[model samples]
Target chain A: VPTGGDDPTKIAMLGLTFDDVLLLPAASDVLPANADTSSQLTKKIRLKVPLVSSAMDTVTEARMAIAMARAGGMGVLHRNLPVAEQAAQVETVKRSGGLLVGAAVGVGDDAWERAMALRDAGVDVLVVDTAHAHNRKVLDMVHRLKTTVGDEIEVVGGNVATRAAAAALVEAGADAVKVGVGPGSICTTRVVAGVGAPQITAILEAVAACAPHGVPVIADGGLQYSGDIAKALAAGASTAMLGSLLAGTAESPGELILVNGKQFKSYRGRVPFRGPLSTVIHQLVGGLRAAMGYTGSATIEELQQAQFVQITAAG
Target chain B: VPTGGDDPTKIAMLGLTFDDVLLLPAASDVLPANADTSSQLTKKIRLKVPLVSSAMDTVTEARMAIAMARAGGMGVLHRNLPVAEQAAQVETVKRSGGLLVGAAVGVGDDAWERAMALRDAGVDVLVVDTAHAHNRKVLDMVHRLKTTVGDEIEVVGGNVATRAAAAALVEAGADAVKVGVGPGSICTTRVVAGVGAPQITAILEAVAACAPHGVPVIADGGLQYSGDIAKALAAGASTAMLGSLLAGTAESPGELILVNGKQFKSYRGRVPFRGPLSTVIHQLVGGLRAAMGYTGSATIEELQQAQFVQITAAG
Candidate 1:
């Protein structure tokens, strides 16, 4: 990545995040850095980045969504918010020129109508945003949404991370699959219910199990940086879903404040944190751009195929 | 994350350069959070963070390497440099504490000799850094290294992102498999030669394909911040490998230069730019930390079980 006058080499590797674990195990098998290795679904949908910001009120407000999309990436609006508000926000991000948008699941009786409204209003990318998109109610909701919205609207569904789970969603007409369950920065599922798969393993299982059936996987959540994004893309995910990264930027719903004499930001999650207020702002767009630049890459597509060196620990 | 007193809602997903893409087709299947996602090899290599830094000259110099290890992650030194320099740098990072050492494969015979010497000096991790770790030549070399070194060496090898490729390395005697080919922020193999797979997809493949063979996959590259790191772990990577993010910090080797009247850092890649003189910096670690904080999780393992919300273009 080019930082100022420097080239990409100057950048270094530091601590590993959950994103690393999530991307490592699954990224290589489907998408080998060298063509010598490649899978059937491996060549499917190539996303802009390995990650897309989540649609959480605390995560993907407006500015956060726009930033992610504007960076040649995409972000989804928080489905927990009002439908009209979510639709408007999605529009705003799309208007900002993002490649995709995240839609909520379990639309009320009038939900399909509202989705149609958004689709007619130029919302092409559709995401099934729900805590339980695979549940019977959610599957039924998805089927209804597809039937009412029509297949013309590109629909992405699921909170599932397994092949069987993903297949069920695809059977319901989901164009793409979102593979993950309780794998977010602020999620309480694991803490509350103690059920989840390692994201890396989950992604691999879902991609291998589903892509064979003509379904592509979206390794969602647990991505931290651009390198992880690259790894995710290499892992066989047509695209990656993200969160948290959007929480500390200027565009997010937070205000700039002084922390220990340093400029800072904040972001919140549902349940515990609410209300339209200042949350967080982490780094500037330059950081991510610089990161891509470091690998001597310009586009997200380029990032997926970049070179990565593996190392060991010193005693 | 703690953006001080700022509201968490307004935060932005900064650090991404234009041209980045984030969005994917959602999946259908759901895996409960907290599923047993460990690979066949090292199921539990406990650490505070899930990330491990790549050992590159410009990136994991000294300060950055130390910090990465200190944060519960590992750091590897680039092998392209001289043996004495590499060893000294490793020593320096170790002095800083908690750092891991990754021996670059392309190192001259002198460096190879030094690598053995370094191993004797007591390095916990042993990574064979090569442009291609899948090739038999590299594998033979790794075998010799292992025989000469001993099993106590937590050997890590390969940039392979596929199960077949990872299996190849594992057969050669790699305890942990490093996944990812051309997914680094500064590597250019994919663009130059059109190689590499989607990172997350690759991880999935590696885990699903290689894990049963008793090989653990490490999601290497494409990760930027904490969220992605979390994703890597959740995806089932035994460890998340990092690069780019470590560069541009005080620890990396680069000079802060004035660019367009703005204070800027340096970062570079192995191609087009050489070492030492190729001062450059890319990515940041702090942003990742904040992301972890936002997740309300600390350990990388916990991050692997966070929740996810599928997203799309419209609400």
Candidate 2:
């Protein structure tokens, strides 16, 4: 008889996404400190843990954004909504726990003004989200922000695959640059353009060239779980941005729906305020800080320096 | 006009996850350095990169596994088949560059003997795949392997979520513990069991807890691309035991099918592998090293330390 190989106490979770692994532990689980230590990320924010919720239309609504922020991590807001709407959403997330808001580039002539408005509205960080941070237009924008906004506002940018690209963003006044291209779960870029890097390889090569410049890196996409977030940070990412994990949370703006017998929240890649890069948004809760707290971390800075080990594959 | 929000060039090359922005670069772009610098995963054996393919029945056939291994990462052999079949598959994967054979705990005497025989046949590592690693059964078997086998084989265990579980496995004589459950793209454990750890939290906590005992932690699931692999390592995972990324590779052994007009290799998990405290096993693969090389990494150790960065929700 084909009995369910199901164990009430255990389950194999090898192919799910971070969103698929919903339900955080009610409380933190602490462990005895071990004697292993490793160096990672330029020391801007020493992440004690690796984990962050990707901001997307279907993933990161206010609740999710707050939770992630409280966890000491950051959540990127999908710039899919109109700028005003996006700014409003960022403000909502900020109310949760002072989350950093990610807005796309191409704000027309009003980018700086809008950014200033957001800054005045209490936005902690300003991410010049763009599909290609290595491009001249985006780079110019990053520089513009740096020159006008000053360094008080943390500026983030990019989605380049190579070493030079990573360097370009830094020169363009980006405190950090996003890495990887076409590595998302719902993305069809690879099939459509065949121009992106193989994510894992891309991150590695990009990290290798960028880390030396003292510019922080971020593993932008293809993250399925909190563990993957940690992996990204460990790989040289100052932070690991997420999208799916935060989707469908209490604060997420997405509506819950039934899909093939499953209850799911709507997640999109483009929203109104999104820069030249994003298309939707998601619904999520708990914010970025919550994700950090769940991992026994206090900040996204600490997550970048966490330790790790290897295991043999199980059958 | 509902223009595509996704950056085709950026999306094709460096998008992050399923729920990320569908960013399209306005122009061919470059990234900055340090975007994903902290995502490298290191181990005794250097994989050209840190990415690994999951050993799922639908995902990890010899073809996929071989391709993944050749790509410069290790591919695990899953064990949902007859012991003989599993062993035979393991033997075959051994021919690939960097391959790890994954299996269930409570190995029958014949299975153990066969495993030992396979060891004699030159298998490098023995992974005791299980949803729960803190159990008496797995411990008992690990003890037997350690006391009787004299350590010729590298024994790894679990798909555990907590550090304590990882510690238990390590104390029980396993070299490394697999972290994550029900966090796969096609996994249903979270729904089936209502349990699972955020992969980032699980990996971070497990790695922190186990690294002290010199026991390594491998971020086991929920990875869809190379960036996630890098993030897993950044979170302190010595290795990333992946399944989905390698699922559709030519070297994998599963039948390819189209879902929503997109091609995908099948992959699944038992219930136990769903929660933060789960595990299970079921398939094999061919190559991984070559897969790593594409990422420009030369070894697993280097892969563990690869680079990455954070991405704004824009892209």
Candidate 3:
């Protein structure tokens, strides 16, 4: 009989965010370098490692898509570009021998057309991106894509929090659900509209809803620490999608500058220059992998079964 | 019957340290500024705020002693200097309107001579500085100082971890016990000797032993963060003594250096220069005070009774 692992229930009942809790270390024989971070992108696709660069083109463009694929993770090209332009970027990643790649699209025909173009360009997954994914329009797109391009490519949807929302997306035939309302940083954008669940609790709810349907969940928003990627995975996210974390690296689309004798790159904000994606990917993957060593987890499956505990903000 | 706050017993039962756990935030109405940070250095002496600069002369001399007093904390002038040279530093702080100053003395006759010189120079406390305050020689010195000038000044002793050690020091007539076997950093020197309790557990044991005697405990060891100091206070310490945390500041005795446009100081190790005692003291006190706002603790007594929880190393 399996006992409830440490105290994630204590954490969930408290409605904790990433900063409010930590993954508890356990007895281990596994080393970090050997921990298998392999995880799902959908029910169909799996990443060599469990990280996804964001769909915000300002942060993730053709450059990072190629770099992220080479790094054994995945990247989602933004739909903010024109249809051909977006298709052109996906083509570049595929041409670059894209290991696994995703492309973000909106709702309705624009979403359908974007998916068609991306599929033609050999994109692996289509993320039907939205602020609130529980609405009928988002569901219509998910159903439409599954019926239309579903036989061709995996369709992912939502920035949903509720278990009902996650269940709805799974019923709409979403291969995966992107979970979170917005950057669950200090002040989530949802605060402007009085929306969103605590990020960690949101992941728990989304996973619980989707787990029965055998669908994966991509965690987006407010991962301020590299360790948070692992926590999200431990909370049942198949992959953690990032914007801010990947914004400063050399491969990220940004202009480098030297000011006050220090290096910085402008990425919608002035980010300290963090050299190459290879090194940054290693750093981020290293953090998530380090957790596996302490928990004695040999694989993502073992890690998701690992335990954690709550802590205070004061220290 | 009084309830146990949170799970400190769960923490202590596991033999945890500062990084292993955190104070749980609670219902609160108080703000950081209004919280009464005032705390006891002994049953006799109270600090306006509860911070103590280290006994290492390289970190604390006349300058930081005066600065610490002005910052509402106390500093102990180190015993590394010649007897009169150490006394002169104490005299300097006193002349600088010494709010409350402590001076370090070693074991035996020279320790007694050093104590007299410092006492005559108006030092408020004589710390019986030793690596092993649990030993008989250290206890004999504590008794010697307490019996000789017990009326003139308060005497502190120890770097003890166990309750028995704390009880022994108190019975020897110590005003307060300085607890922690050593740095408690990643590699405590005690590790080489296969000795020492976990620092947080050490503080709990020391406090438990001293509480009945109405004696206070000074925590001396690895407090790498300003928030760790707050955690020590929440762990039942009256004051937290720091060495490395205070070493990089301008008031710290190390000589300043500029390498490649970054400032550093050599204090037994190279540390980045953290400007000024005033700002750093505010930063330290503010961290401890912030806990007050979260826990609704308006005084040190309230904070000592505050609750906390355990967490993992991964995040």
Candidate 4:
């Protein structure tokens, strides 16, 4: 919270996460039922909603992406599998008309091959995804993809935390930046690697760095509730990528596991069965709508201009 | 997060809760087992451990207070009873050797009478507890208590959020200020009246106002986990009062209720059945010790001086 410094990280020194703050109410005539939630996914791609299902092994696949697209959002197919299999997931979703979806691809020899497969499968966005995306390798892949297929498809790069990383990604021809590092329930990068940024600060840094270049920043993790999606927008993120919340949905990969009487999807850090994806979307949209109503923001753009207050674990 | 401003609430605009932020690791040679957790409960009252059991009807009774005192902390007996009953609860705790206990009393016709009964019962601290304590009535009670039993007992007054309120309580001769409003699991004052401060900012405000007078500020509620206690200390709170976390413990005044196969005590906001107060204290101290180790602080005073990084709902 130290001010009057050239260091942007000074503002982020508090390492504020989503649960650390709440949005202050602004004078509003905006109605929750009529609030606009449209958002940019990349330089060229757009979504009817601001939520994007995360690219996790248990989260997004053909069904999840298709479901999310039908719900007015989109999903990123996880790249944990081989190129053909991951691309096949996208191909499955793309088979349906009027659907826009993304697919994750890593660096090295498979980067081009993977993008090529996804491109042929009609993947709208090729996310140059990695555990840490602000590196030379990830940037190189993003540059190569944009150079090869930049006009054909949008390239979303990163998983970064600083202003420099966002700038570097933007310069690398990334149409959008994914802002997050170890900010997830299932991710252990923070304790294991001791490197990462708090989600809000990371989004703020990326948004600050990407705004001039007109690159949208996707806040990619650590969201527990819908208020977080609202806060992410307030921090200038174009969309929020959800994992656990999306991972446990009916459309998400993985079968249901019954414990006692309650049902669960995937294990560890515990992802509860949240019923249908539409219900989840409804609840999230409800939270965001409430946020927009409170902040008097009728659209996501106005939400981006909205402000927040920081407080402790009291009321 | 606006700076160069005269408003304290601006800094608190984020309305951070405990779950919203995480403690950043710092250089450390300190061991969690070796870290000191001792803290001040009042001007003259020091606790071996920094935790204080809350004054809730469902939480602290005579047995709970005795158990808390035996475990190297203290508990404030709830004042939701007639003077004889509450004083008897304190008296029950005092019957045991080497136990320091507190008793709450509301501001009304019963204020002086309750304090006098608690004083007669050998209560070490008289908490002028109320839903709100910055009013003329509460201040007058604090003033009256200090005039009478202040020489024999520590008079802790509050449930206030602002610096002016803290100053008023201190000027009215409170030895310590209990800081919180609508920040409890059982309290709905925030939603009901739309009045309250976030816990960390309230602590900061009270601490800022009371530091000059050397009066300790107790962070009274909104704590959901052990890390919150560390945060409360870092936020300049001498000790944090626990309600829900300590409510369903074995020593707390609640019977086990069977639900399907799981066991619960007095519920809502869902207080789980923690086996013992000692386990809770141990876990809380472990968290505080780990916080100290991460910050390289050896004791509570050093931990107080240690700063925190604000973060989003991330790791």
Candidate 5:
């Protein structure tokens, strides 16, 4: 069941995020446990589970990346650290196992050097993340990265909200597009800059634009609940990227602290809040399974085509 | 700004809640302190602020109603009590001041008696509320009340989410329609019955139906922040009915408790959460004012015409 109109001119028309819409229950033969969660991250890369841990400062590092990979999801090392440090972080994750290692870079920053270093350290994916990724600078960087190392490492470019941006990045040779702008729990881009579409809308728009180019979309941020993971994938995202949800994990890069008798980890978004990443990932994967079962989808690919219903506020 | 398509078939199209959209900033000439929040509750009744305390068991009593009226908003006493008790509660509020006293009633369940008693107790408005108020039962009761004592007391019938419902109720002589089905912090109606619309969509639809009839729409439930009040009014609601936000106020009818050294009052929807009603109301009114300032709306009516932006998840 559709809840919104297709007209782009009706900008005020409500753009729903994860919580605004729900997946309707269809006749299902598969149980939640039996619903396959494996999905593609890029045309060349696939994950056992369609989840990507955010590369936030307090969220992912070598330890968290290792755990995420072990759990069948992928993790991207944060780019907040120095080039050598970030590359070393990627190296650690690569050294841990045969799992794919990913690292983040930004526009016009040491992105070229960082991407090269990460590539040398055996990083399989380079997430070119920025506050806004639909710009000339970002597109130029994506083009540069694709020209330089796109053959060896998958270059995922993003932090975009519109179809135009997604199409441009794909045209510039981005292997996959990270679809999200200002949807992060701690990201203030939307409020501060008043730019960006709701995640679902962004994903749908970007996917529509990038699909013809065979570019996958990675839905990044604004995930507050496990249901959001399912919503993101159902909206056509190849993977749902998480930050805050993974920050409090045992393997996350932070020390546990006792706050008024409550054990907590320092969680932040580019930005602190706390919760265990393990519990979050568990719930997220479980929610996805249930969502798939509801939609009669046996695998993440089927889920990507699953029907959606715009529900009442409570749903 | 029109946010959604007028199409009825796109049920997957999202209907935004208050939190899902934000008022776009306009070139403002007025300040928040000077912006007039005064708006009508009905064609005849007006309020300094477009706020109403919910008629929930834990929210509005005579005391809270009296305080709300004194503060220039209105309050509806819940209909959960017996006739005499509810009448006495109405009497308490009426006796407190000349401010318009409002009370709630349900269809076919002592509604006639409750209306008579509330009228006898000098209540000015009778909120004919029901879990679903769009049906013939509610229409019959509204017609009966209008035929019996329409001139003596104004009747507000609702708890509806559709344009047809609003129009039918207004045609049946409801002075106003209460718009909301689920969307309440504690309401489970949508989940339990898979019914109701998002408050923004509901309000917009209902208001569109009621406006030609000069009937008002009271946005009820799912108000989580001060900004929501502004959004509701901006969506064409004459006023907003609040429950959880006002449940923790000192004037609210609830026992105070200390949880982990923080003082909290028992707050709930159909059930309990803990928070301070005073802080909530302050923030709510303040936020509305700020939103008005941002939108350049001098009053609630102007706010109803204010432009809105369907924003990203970060908003």
Candidate 6:
């Protein structure tokens, strides 16, 4: 269906990441302030804005989750801590009276119990998070969750890159599939193992794969700028999940430290951090609105349908 | 034909920047030190290595050009100075005795004189440089050079992206085409004007268009890391032209300044300078070698024929 003078085969295999593409601007009918940011987090779950905080140790915790939920988006509690601690973190967010509460879990017997605990503690979603979700282990966990916790809570499975992986998770009862392998500022999976589809391609592949099953796709990681978040939505991801962007926030777990006259929060990786939840979120939402207005997209869903142009060095 | 579950249309329109993609590795048959880095800079101009310094204000002075040329690559002198100064810069490189000395020009009467002067001064190549070279003005200039200067010197026309632009330039007698728009570290064209094809995609488009005619494509701008150089060659670029990477070298034009106990050379657009030309070149060549080795490419030509996989956030 490609009609350009360029070969589609080369462009296809040329798979682009977020930095590779730019959302093409159309004649705008909407203003930046008027662009709607609301989007679906899953088939049954709707977020006031299409943003998700990553389930990273230094990124999301009780306070951050509460803040994210209050900001009209959901935050997934990181699974680095002990099961009880993670459950307690989820409980803290649940008790804060936010719209939706999310907690992450791994693939094991303990993970199943942790998922049950988080659900019991009123967590709205249970993320079956894994480094490689396309593997049999993650699929088995998704199936197990469906057989056990079925309709009680939303089950979001990730982090998958390919179509088959997303399809399997959706078929195994994932309400939404998180797409992104590596592509994180602090993540070393790509550098160490050299295995991943570019984030945009991953989101596109997964979103297309799970669309027939009515599953939403979450574009997680490599989200440094607000433009990236908008691009994620345009690529058909229901939400843009962030890690580093929220790591240094006041509501996040890290303590603020002064380094060379710059205030920073120490994250797992050596990279320093930036922002408080409200300020960052405000800027992000503002940027998103501006991008939407530029693209003439009045809503997040409409933005997904809007056309985009890949950019060169100059643009 | 495209394989896998990706939408051809989505992949087609989605452009990619250099930072968006990471080079993938195959089982290596050679060591990094053993990888051959030689490649063609044009149909007739061959580079001992697949690297070129960009013609930016702070980069590619006579000394830098001489260093780059001596080190087995070529450098394009920036066109910001007056005709005599620019020609003298070319003469400086020529006088220093290098393999190939390049100088830049625009589309005007003065540009014609500058090109002729540089050619007479022993500059090996004259770049018909422009911020946007896909338009009629550039095409006219290419034809003008071919009509007038003929083959007194190789005329490289650019910076353009897309197959049609490359074809037009080649048909108009451009010896080589520079591919890239905006993707420079200091370039605001993409963000300001919202135009440009991503560098890799731009190279691919131009290379495919010029291949049938045996015309070479030079991938210019948006190159930060050494891997980008290799990826550029692999994407069908005959040479990888750089700006920011070469700006801070000791052999470059900028003078050193001490800021907060750190020494730096201030370049245009507030980018900090880096390295002695030899050190940066060595590291870049080393990185290229390692990348080629990892990809199982014995030579730059083989590297161009090697396949690439799009990476995710992690991988």
Query: DockQ of candidates 1 onward, in order?
Result: 0.03, 0.04, 0.01, 0.08, 0.09, 0.08
Write the residue-wise lDDT of candidate 4 on A1-315 in tens digits. Answer: 222112233224656678766788999999999999998988888899988998887888889999999999999998889888987888788788779999988886777888899999898999988655655667888998899999989999977776777888899999999988656556554432223467887788788899889999999878888889999999999999998778789998889988899989993345889999999999999999999999999999899999888866663
In the range A1-315, model 1's lDDT, one tens digit per residue, is 445555643432122223332221222211232222111121233344334667666567667656654454556666666667777876675676535555554445666666765686566566776655667777776677678765466677778855567768877877777877866546657688875655644565565555566766777776655445444544446566656655555555656656565665555521222222222111222323333433334444454444332221100
What digit string (tens of lDDT, one per residue) describes model 3 on residues B55-113? Answer: 88668898998999998889999998788998888888888764789999988668778
Best by TM-score: 3
* Shift in Å, residue B15, candidate 5: 2.7
| Chain B fold agreement for model 2, TM-score | 0.67
Model 5 lDDT tens row, B1-315? 155688655554467676667555443455678989888887788888788898888888888888888777888998888999999998888777687778988876577888898889988888888878879988999888878877878888888887778889988888888888876457677788876678877787788788878888999888866667777887788998988778877788877777776676676522233344445556567777776655567888888776555754433
User: Candidate 5: where are CA atoms >4 Å away?
Assistant: A1-315, B1-13, B258-263, B267-279, B312-315
- Locate the minimum summed-lDDT window of 10 residues in model 1 chain A: A33-42
Higher-lDDT candidate of 2 and 6: 6
Give the alpha-carbon lDDT of every model: 0.54, 0.52, 0.79, 0.81, 0.77, 0.78
CAPRI class assigned to model 5: incorrect
Of 5 and 6, the candidate ranking higher by DockQ: 5
Of candidates 4 and 3, the better by DockQ: 4
| TM-scores of the models, in the order given | 0.44, 0.43, 0.57, 0.56, 0.54, 0.54
Q: In candidate 3, list every pair of residues with a backbone clash.
A: B24-B308
State which candidate, 1 or 5, has the greater TM-score.
Answer: 5
Clashes of 2: 247
Tell me the tens digit of each residue's lDDT in model 2 across A251-310.
Answer: 556555765665665665422222111112111112223333333434444533332222
Q: Please report how far candidate 5 places residue A128 from its true position, in Å.
A: 32
Docking class of 6: incorrect
Q: Please state every model's RMSD to the true fold in angstroms.
A: 19.6, 19.6, 13.3, 11.8, 11.7, 12.4
Off by over 4 Å in 2: A1-49, A93-107, A269-315, B1-315
